[PDB]
Assembly symmetry: D2
Homo-oligomer: 115 residues x 4
């Protein structure tokens, strides 16, 4: 409930469906440890990645597999994937939404943090 | 239900609340006639602008009063407002979401059309 | 020049070439008066729209004709055009770059404003 | 040059100056090897990172140090950095411009790819 991911398609004007998303947490030795993953729904959303109990302060990476998404549509893309890296802080609001708007040679990403 | 507007703030990482939004429809004589309006909610959303019965094919303009939003926050903005102009077509999906992501000197806008 | 427009294509990863651009200025009577127009070059840039002398204080609208652009590529896009409306030169002369990044159902626009 | 990076500030309406940028290339062993680095100029541009000879086929990562940028302006931003990962030169040499538009809680990036 603390972390949700939403992906939109700027070519078709639609949610980006069945996009793979991987989340990692930074470990003591500076490597990225798998944390959570899933595929976006028909609404372009990925819910249920983690819980309040598990989502402690730390540095997290969200990797969105944009290349496979475009290839499935028959479109040649530029990026291998989209990556969003951020620090989770207990000071700020409690719910994080990471959103990405996708085009073949561009993407935009923003965070909405509420509560 | 056919038309919803969502506004986000890229400086604060939050919904853009209490932003004025005006919708117009293009008339026969080429002028813009008021159609619907409102202010975004605490979630940054504006629901209930129109009905399926009233939202006929035509050219529509959505004007978002970004200047007043930034001025209320004490921030000097570039744009007078953000404007989104589009044709509604019965061919395509039935529900239109117009989203805008706001910064003082930039904005991005996208449309999600579903069903 | 004091006003330049740059347009990029996010589907192709290229400048958006031959895009029509019309500029208007709000008149004393509150109507939009034609001010300048042109088309983007092979670099996606449009220079020479105006001069420091002619580009006085006022509210300006830069209308970028994205629909025509996309239709010629075989795409039926969402927007009729992209419109950028701003006050210019109200604290003295500035140089303005208006940039737009285009996709079929989305666009992003930003401005870079410098002082000579 | 075959690889240029441009960075803009959406809060100020200006080039983003003195932004650190690090480039890496994926090694045969699947690790990220340092490839080039630099900082943006007063124009927000970073030129001279590499040459056509050195910029061979491979997977590259361009890491833009946005957090440090924002903190010096008194803003605590959301992202640690902005990272752009792409395959380059796999159909022969190309010229790449990587552009990034920055806000405290958002960034947009695009690429323009041309053939000389
Ligand atoms: O629900 C959302 O969070 C949402 C977000 C966007 C959006 C995403 C990235 C961006 F740069 C601009 C946007 F409007 C666009 C739409 I349409 C959205 O619905
Ligand atoms: O010269 C440029 O490459 C340039 C690019 C942008 C820009 C950058 C990223 C983006 F997502 C959208 C833009 F318009 C904005 C401006 I103003 C530019 O001048």
């Amino acid at each position: 409930c603390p972390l949700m991911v939403k992906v939109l398609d700027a070519v078709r004007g639609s949610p980006a469906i069945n996009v793979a998303v991987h989340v990692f947490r930074k470990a003591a030795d500076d490597t990225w440890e798998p944390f959570a993953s899933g595929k976006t729904s028909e609404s372009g959303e990925l819910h249920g990645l983690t819980t309040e109990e598990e989502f402690v302060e730390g540095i997290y990476k969200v990797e969105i597999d944009t290349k496979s998404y475009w290839k499935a549509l028959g479109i040649s893309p530029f990026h291998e994937h989209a990556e969003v890296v951020f620090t989770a802080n207990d000071s700020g609001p409690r719910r994080y939404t990471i959103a990405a708007l996708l085009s073949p040679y561009s993407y935009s990403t923003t965070a909405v943090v509420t509560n």
